[PDB]
Design a protein around this ligand. Structure first.
Ligand SMILES: [Cl-]
Ligand SMILES: [Cl-]
Lengths: 131, 129
């Protein structure tokens, strides 16, 4: 069983990105499985009416098309603040409720190694760039 | 000097070891003292003592009556992905109503993309500086 819960199945959301492969399959889950079998598949569009599963490498190009749903290679990728493809743990994560972001900028200034910060939801996260 | 980005009445101090302490009449004057020292990241000014405590390291917040803790400048108001030296995105796209994983897909699918940010409806792609 693959998780297909992170994207809408009934909003007619397609991607125009050029195909890497096309097959027909019986479910969104099966289309995800086809994506995951291809090293360079980043996302897919499955059509519930035609049963076509279009696997794609490039960045999604969203558009509207009846019966389409567009899913990622996997729903496991749930990072949103600053998210490295190769992985990069924050140097620090603090609750900064009631603080301005400029105090998170101050934290980064004062933290050796800190190249950038994020301040989503008043949480101050510090990061070093990787290499 | 804009001193409005932080609270003045919430008794917020910082324990960070200080660079120095001086006396001043206002938070704005404390911020000025902070800006005169190259390594001052933040300060705690106290309403009652009139002491302005200039600090280099990361804030260490705590509660202390009459304290207020401000940054070197309120102007550093970036809150998404904020590079200390600046960094323009490779790409900025409208991904309203999409899971973060589809922004991950966008970064995977974009040569040069090292990382992404997806707060709100905007999927932003970056290469490292
Ligand atoms: Cl459209
Ligand atoms: Cl690449």
């Amino acid at each position: 069983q693959l998780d297909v819960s992170c994207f809408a199945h009934d909003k007619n959301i397609g991607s125009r990105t050029e195909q890497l492969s096309v097959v027909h399959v019986a479910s969104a889950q099966d289309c995800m499985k086809e994506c995951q079998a291809l090293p360079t598949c980043s996302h897919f569009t499955y059509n519930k009416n035609s049963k076509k599963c279009h696997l794609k490498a490039g960045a999604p190009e969203f558009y509207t098309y009846t019966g389409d749903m567009t899913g990622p290679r996997s729903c496991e990728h749930n990072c949103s603040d600053a998210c490295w493809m190769d992985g990069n743990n924050p140097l620090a994560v603090w609750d900064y409720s009631g603080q301005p972001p400029a105090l998170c900028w101050a934290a980064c200034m004062g933290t050796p190694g800190c190249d950038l910060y994020t301040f989503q939801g008043m949480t101050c996260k510090l990061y070093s760039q990787t290499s």
